[PDB]
């Protein structure tokens, strides 16, 4: 239970880690939704990811 517990919050840390990275790429597409150099499919794709 302790290894599953601490392993579970470590996996929580990696999930919020790569989740935070993908959220920052969403924020890049928020910076780049003006001109046509990103895709709305990739904007909403990274949002659904």
């Amino acid at each position: 239970y302790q290894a599953t517990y601490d392993s579970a919050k470590g996996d929580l840390a990696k999930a919020q880690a790569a989740a935070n990275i993908a959220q920052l790429t969403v924020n890049r597409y928020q910076k780049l939704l003006g001109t046509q150099y990103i895709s709305k499919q990739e904007y909403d794709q990274a949002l659904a990811d």
């Binding site: 890049r28 780049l32 150099y37 990103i38």
Partner: protein, 49 residues
């Protein structure tokens, strides 16, 4: 044949001037196309595509 050849090569040479202008301008707008897709390509590298 000097009036004839003179009209022949003044109009021929006129067509050569026209040819350098028109092929030059097609080189211009072709360069414009290479720079639009080049520039858009580089901007897609600025996000990393």
């Amino acid at each position: 044949t000097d009036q004839q050849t003179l009209i022949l090569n003044t109009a021929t040479a006129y067509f050569n001037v026209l040819n350098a202008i028109d092929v030059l301008s097609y080189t211009q707008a072709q360069k414009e196309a290479i720079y639009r897709q080049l520039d858009q390509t580089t901007q897609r590298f600025n996000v990393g595509l």
